[PDB]
Amino acid sequence: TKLKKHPRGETEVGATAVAFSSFDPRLFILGTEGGFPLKCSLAPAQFTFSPHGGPIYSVSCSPFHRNLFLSAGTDGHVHLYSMLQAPPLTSLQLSLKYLFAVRWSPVRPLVFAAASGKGDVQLFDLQKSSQKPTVLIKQTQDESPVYCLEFNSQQTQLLAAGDAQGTVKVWQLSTEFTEQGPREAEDLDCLAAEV
Amino acid sequence: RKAVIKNADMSEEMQQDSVECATQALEKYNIEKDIAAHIKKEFDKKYNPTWHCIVGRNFGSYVTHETKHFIYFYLGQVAILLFKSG
Amino acid sequence: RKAVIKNADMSEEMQQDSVECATQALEKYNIEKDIAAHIKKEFDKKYNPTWHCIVGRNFGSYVTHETKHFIYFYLGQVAILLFKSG
Amino acid sequence: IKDPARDPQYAENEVDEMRIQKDLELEQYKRSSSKS
Amino acid sequence: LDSNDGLLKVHYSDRLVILLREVRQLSALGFVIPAKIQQVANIAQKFCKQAIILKQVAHFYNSIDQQMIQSQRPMMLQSALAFEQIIKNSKAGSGGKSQITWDNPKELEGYIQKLQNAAERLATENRKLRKWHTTFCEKVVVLMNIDLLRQQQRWKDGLQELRTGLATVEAQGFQASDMHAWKQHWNHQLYKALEHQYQMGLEALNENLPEINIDLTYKQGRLQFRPPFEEIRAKYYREMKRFIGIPNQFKGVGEAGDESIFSIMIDRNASGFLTIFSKAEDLFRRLS
Amino acid sequence: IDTPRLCSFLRAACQVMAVLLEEDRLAASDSSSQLNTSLPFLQNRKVSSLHTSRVQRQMVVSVHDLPEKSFVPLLDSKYVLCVWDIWQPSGPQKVLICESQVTCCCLSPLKAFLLFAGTAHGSVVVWDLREDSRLHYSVTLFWTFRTATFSTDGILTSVNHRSPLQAVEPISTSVHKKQSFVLSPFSTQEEMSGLSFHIASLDESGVLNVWVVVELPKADIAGSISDLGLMPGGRVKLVHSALIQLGWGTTQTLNVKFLPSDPNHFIIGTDMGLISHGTRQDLRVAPKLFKPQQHGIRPVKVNVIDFSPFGEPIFLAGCSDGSIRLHQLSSAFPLLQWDSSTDSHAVTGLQWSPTRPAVFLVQDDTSNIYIWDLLQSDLGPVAKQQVSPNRLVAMAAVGEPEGSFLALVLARASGSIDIQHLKRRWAAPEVDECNRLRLLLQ
Amino acid sequence: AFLKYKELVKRPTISKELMLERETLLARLVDSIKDFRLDFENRCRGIPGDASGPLSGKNLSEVVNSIVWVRQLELKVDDTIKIAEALLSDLPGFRC
Amino acid sequence: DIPRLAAFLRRVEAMVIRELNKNWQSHAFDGFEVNWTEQQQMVSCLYTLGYPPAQAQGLHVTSISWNSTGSVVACAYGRLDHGDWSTLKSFVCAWNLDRRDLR
Amino acid sequence: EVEETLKRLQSQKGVQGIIVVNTEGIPIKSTMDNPTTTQYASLMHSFILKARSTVRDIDPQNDLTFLRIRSKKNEIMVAPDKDYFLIVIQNPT
Amino acid sequence: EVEETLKRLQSQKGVQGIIVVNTEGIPIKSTMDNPTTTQYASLMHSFILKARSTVRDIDPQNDLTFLRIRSKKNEIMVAPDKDYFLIVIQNPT
C-alpha cells in the first residue's frame, strides 16, 4: 500500500492512469486528477510537471531513451517532458474537445499517434511535422467519437480503436517503416530541452 | 503463427487438420512437450492410433511413416512433425 | 559427446548399443538428419524394424513405443530419442 | 525483305528487355528436350 | 547556323581588350588617363557584360537543343522554329536596336530575358513530352508480357490505354505531324511486343491450351472414346487455328494506317508450324 | 528472370562488382621518369594546365584543348578534362567535357563526389563524379565519355556577374546543422542537407561568391529547369566585397588563396603590387595589407599565390619580376624577400613540396625549376634543373605521407605529359623536424 | 510561429516588416473568439448532451461538465487576447 | 598463457588496424536498395470488425487490448455510460484473427 | 545491358568466374564449368542465408546489406536479394 | 603492448567495440557491454565455423582468410587464427 503530499488535509491523491518505464521497474508516472503529473517510485515523489495543468485522463511512459513522457488531460494538449528535469519539451496543440488514448511503440522509431475526442486518430512523424498530422484515420459521416485506442504489442501492424458503437475496428498500417537515421529526433529533443 | 507446409504424405483434409490442431495447441501451451501431446492425442482419437508428434525449434529426424499419414510443417519458427506408425 | 541417459525402457545391452551407435554417428556425421538416419538404420538391422530416431538441441515429443524399446539420452548438449513403433 | 535490323526505329527499355527475353526463352525451349 | 547551334557574333572584340589593358596599365604606371578613354572604357565594360549574358542564353538554348534533337519530335521542332522566328525577327530590328548597349543596356536586359523565357518554356514542354514518352514505353514493356492463350483482354485494355493517352496529348493542341511520327514508331514497338509472344505460343501450343475431357468406354463392346477421336482432333486443330489467326485483327496505335505491319509475322514465322504439327501428332500418338 | 523487374538486381550486382574492381586497382634522388601518354582521345589536343588532388593523393587532372584539327570526324567538343592516376597503367581513367573554355578547376576535398571548374565567360560548372557509366555516348576501341552538369548558363541570376572567373576553391567551413528547430517552418537544417563544403569563385571584378547545393533523391526528368540527369543546382548564393582599400579608379584582382587551417581567412592579390587580407565571419579581425620593405607602388603584377602546408600560417606569393615573398599571416611585412635566380624572367608556377621538409619549388619562363630547402641551407636554391624539351606549361608535386611516395608531373607546350619520382627527399624524417622547429624559432 | 519567436517579432525592425502578417493574425484571432462566443451561446444552457460534454465524473452532476467546458473556453479566449496584445502593439485591430 | 594470447593479438591487430580503416572510408557502392517485401499501398481500413452482435446494438466500446502471446486474440469490452455502479452491464468479447475465423 | 556489364567484368584479370543463381541454387547463367557452377551456387545460397540470420540475431530489425568471404585461393562476394542474388569469384592476388 | 594496440584500435572513429573470443565462442576480453559481449561472440563463433567449412567445401585445399559482414545497423569483421579469432564492430556512418 501511499503517496500523499501534506497528509490529513486537502490531500486526496487520485489518478486516472499509470505508466511504467521499461527502463526500470521503479520508475512510473501517476496521472493525477489534480492535473499535474507526479513522478513516484514507490511514498516518495520528485517532480511536479507544471506544463500540464488540466486533470489527466491518459499517461504513457517514454519509449526508448527515456525522455518522451506523455501526459494529456482536459487541456487537449499532449505535453511531452523528460523526468530528468521536468521541462516543457513540446505540446501538441490539437484544437479538439478531449483526448482519450495515445499510441506509442518502443519497438518502432520515435513516432506518435493518438485518438482524440472528435473521432479522428492522428499520426505524427516526428522527422516531418510537429503540429500537422501526417496520416489521419476518419470515421463515417455521423459516427460519434472514438473512445479508446490501443496497439498490439506483437506489432504485426495491428492497430485497434473503438467507436461509439460496440464495435472495434482494426487497421493495418504501413506508414511506420523502420530506417537508419530517425534517432535524430532524440537528439533534437534533448537539445531543445537544454536550451 | 504463419503455417508453411514443406512436405506431406497425407490427404488435403488431414493436412489442414494437422496444422489447425497444432495451431490451437501452440495457442494453449508454451512447452513443446505439451504441444506435441495435444496434437498426438487428438489424432489418435479422430484418425485412429498410433500417431507420434515432435515439436521443436532445433532437430533432425529420420523416421518411417504409413502412407497418407505424414506431414512436416512450420508454425513461425517452430517445426511440427506428425505421422502414424504402429 | 559425453553420454548421460535420462530415461529408458530398454535392456542394458540395448542401451549400450544406443549410446555407441549415436556416438559413432556423431563422430562421422555433422548434419542432424544424417546422424539420426545412421542410428535408426543400425537398430533396424540388429533389432528388426521399425525404429525412429530424433536428434536435436531443442524439441519436445510425445510418442508411443513398443515395450522395452525406448531410450532418451544426451550426448553433450544434443538429445537423442530412439524408439520402435510399427 | 524482313528488315531484322529494324533501323528506322528506336527504343531503350523495350529493346533491352526484348534481347533478354529472346535469350531466356530460346534456352528454355532447348532445355525442354522435346523429341518432336 | 541552321544546325541547332546558336552563336554570338562579337564585333569589336579588340576595342574591349585594348581599353581594359589601357586603363589598367595607365593606372598601375601612374599615368594620366584622358577623358575619352575613361568614357569608352566604362562603356566597354557594359559591352563585355552584355556579351557574356548573351553567350549564356545561347548556351542555355544549345543545351535544350541537345536534349531535344535526340528524339526529333515534330512538336518541339515546331516550337523551336517559333523560337528561331523570335531571333530572326529580332535581328531585323537591329536597324535601330544594334546600339541599345551603347546608349542604354536596360532594354537589352529585357530583350534577353524575354528570349530566355521563351527558351525556358520550350525546355519545360520538352520534358513533359518525354514524360509521356516514358509512359508509353512503360505500357509496351507490359504488353510484351501478355499470354496470348489466356489474357486476350490485357491486349484489349492495353491498346485502349495507349490510344487514350495519345488522344489525351492531342487534346492539348498538338499537330498531326507529331502524333504521326509517334504512332509509326510506337506501332513498331507493339509489333515487337506481339511477335515475341506470338513466337512463344507457337512453341508451346501442345501445353497451354484449355483442357479437354473425354470418357473411355466400350461402345458395342469396342473400346472407344466419347466423344470420338476424330472429333477431339478437329477441336485441337481449331484451337491452334484461332491462335495463329491473331496477327490479323490487332488495332495497334494509329489504327487508321496499315495493319500488315503486324500480320507479316505470320509468314515470317511460318517455320514454327513444323514444330507445332509434329508435337500435335506426338500428342495424338500418346492418346492412342 | 524474364522480367526487367528482377534484372534490376542484376544491374545493381554489376555496379557493386565494378566499384570493387576499381578499388582493387588502387595498388602501387635523381632523374627516374615514367610515362602515361596513351592518346585514346588526346591525339590532337594541347595541354593547358595540371591540377592535383587531396582525396586520392595519387590522382591528377590534366586540361586539354582541341585545335581546329579534328582527329575524329565526330562532333568533338574542344574542351575536355583528363583524369588519370600516377600508379595506374597507361590510359586515362575518366574524362569530362564542356562547351566553352574551361579553367579554374578544382576537386572536392572530402571525397570524389563533385568536380568543379570556372568557365572563361564567368559561368560556373560542376560534374557529378560519383555516377555510373550510362546515358553517355560511348565509342569503340570500350572507352566511354561522360558529360553531366547543369551550368549557371541556364537560369539567369546575378552570381555570374558577367565577368570572367580567375580562381575557385573548396571552402571547408560547413559547421551548421546544430539542430532542426522544433517548429519545422523555422528549421534551417533542412536546407543544409548533404552540404559538407562550399565552393568559392572569384571574378576579375573583385567580387567573391560562395554557394553549394547537394541532393540525391531524384529521377530522370524534373519539372524544374535542369539537365536530364540527377544533379543539384545553384540556388544558394552569398556575395562578399573586396578592394575596399585598393579602390578611372576601378581596380581588379588577380588571384585569391584561402587558409587551409581556418578556411574562413583568405588573401587576395592585385596588379598594383599589393595583397590584402580578410575573412568571412568577422570582417574586422585584421584588415591589413601585405607589402614588402619598399616604397612607391612597384606594380609587380602578382600572379601566383600559395600557402605553406605546415603549422605556421605563412602565405607565399610570386610576381612577374621573379620575386617571391613569405607573407606570414601575423605580419604585414614578409619574412624573407628572396629574388629568385633568373629574375630576368617571371614566375610561371609555384608549389610547396608534399614532403616533411619545407621544400619550395618555382618554375620560370625558361623552364628551369629552382628548389629551396630552407631547413638545411640559406635562401640560395638548394637544387635546380632545366630541360631540353623546354616550353613547360604546367607542373604539380604529388606525394603522400605514408606506403609513401613522391612524384612530380609536368607537361610541355608540345602536348606531351611527363612524370618522375625522386622520393629520396620524402623525409629524413628526424633531421627535418629538428630544423623545422629551429627555423620557426629563429 | 509568432509565439515561438515573439521576442524577435516585438522588435521595432521585425515588427514593422511583419505588419501585414500581424494584422492578418489579428483578423483571424477575431474570427476565433467569434466562433467561441457563438459556440458558448448555443450550448451554455447545457440541455443536449453535446452542450454539456460527457465526462467520467458525470455521476456527481452536470456541474462537472460545465466547469470543464467553460474552463477550455476561458483559456482559449484568454490566450488569444494576450497574444494579440504582445504582437499587434495596440493597433485599431487590437482595440476592436 | 598470456604471451601466447598476446602473440595472437599482435597478428590480428596488424590485419585489422589496416584493413578496417581502408574499408571504413572506402566510400564504396551506395546504391543498395533491397526491401525483401512488396511495397505496401496506402494504409488500409476495416481489416476486421469484431463485436458481440446483439449486445453491440446498445453498448459502446470503452476498453480494448491484445494478447501479447496469442497475437490473434483481440479483446474488447463495451458498456453503457450510466448505471455502472449497480447492475451487470456487459460482457468481455474476444475473437481470434486465426485460422478459420471467418466470422 | 546487364549481359554486357557481366562480360566486361569477366574480362577483368581479377575475375575468375561469375554465376547467376536464381531459384535457390538453380542457376541459369554461368561462365564456369558445370561441376563448379552447381557447387558454387549451392554453397553461396546456404552461406548467405547464415549471414542474414546472424544479422537478425544481433538485432531483430536489421538484415544483410553485403557479405564477403575471402580465402587463399580466391574471394567471393554476394549481395542480399528478394528473389535471387548473384555470385562473383575473383582472385585477390 | 597488445593492450595498448587494442585501445589504439578502439580509439579509431569507426570502431564501436572489440571482443576477443577465446574459448569456443566464450570471450576473455571485451570493450563492450555484457549482453553484446556474449551476443556477438556466440553468433560469430557459429558463423565462422560455417565460413571455414564453406571454403573447405568449395575447395578442399584452402582455409578461411577473412570474413566481413555488413548490415544497416553496423559492420563486423573477423579474421581466422590457429586458436581463436577476434571481433571488431564499426559504425559505417
GROMACS .gro file of C-alpha atoms in nm, chain C residues 17-54:
model
   38
  298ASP     CA    1   2.415  -5.000  -2.840
  299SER     CA    2   2.206  -4.680  -2.841
  300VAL     CA    3   2.494  -4.475  -2.699
  301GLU     CA    4   2.759  -4.649  -2.910
  302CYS     CA    5   2.556  -4.604  -3.230
  303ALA     CA    6   2.485  -4.238  -3.162
  304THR     CA    7   2.847  -4.184  -3.061
  305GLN     CA    8   2.974  -4.320  -3.394
  306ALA     CA    9   2.701  -4.127  -3.581
  307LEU     CA   10   2.806  -3.803  -3.417
  308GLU     CA   11   3.174  -3.870  -3.488
  309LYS     CA   12   3.104  -3.941  -3.858
  310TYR     CA   13   2.817  -3.705  -3.946
  311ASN     CA   14   2.790  -3.330  -3.899
  312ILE     CA   15   2.424  -3.289  -4.005
  313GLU     CA   16   2.137  -3.374  -3.765
  314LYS     CA   17   1.923  -3.568  -4.014
  315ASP     CA   18   2.219  -3.781  -4.117
  316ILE     CA   19   2.313  -3.860  -3.754
  317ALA     CA   20   1.950  -3.969  -3.691
  318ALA     CA   21   1.945  -4.184  -4.001
  319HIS     CA   22   2.261  -4.368  -3.903
  320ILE     CA   23   2.126  -4.452  -3.563
  321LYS     CA   24   1.785  -4.567  -3.691
  322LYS     CA   25   1.929  -4.794  -3.959
  323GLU     CA   26   2.167  -4.972  -3.719
  324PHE     CA   27   1.872  -5.066  -3.495
  325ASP     CA   28   1.650  -5.186  -3.785
  326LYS     CA   29   1.932  -5.422  -3.884
  327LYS     CA   30   2.000  -5.571  -3.541
  328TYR     CA   31   1.668  -5.544  -3.362
  329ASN     CA   32   1.435  -5.551  -3.670
  330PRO     CA   33   1.225  -5.259  -3.794
  331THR     CA   34   1.054  -5.023  -3.742
  332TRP     CA   35   1.273  -4.778  -3.550
  333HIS     CA   36   1.255  -4.398  -3.546
  334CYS     CA   37   1.522  -4.154  -3.431
  335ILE     CA   38   1.516  -3.786  -3.343
   0.00000   0.00000   0.00000
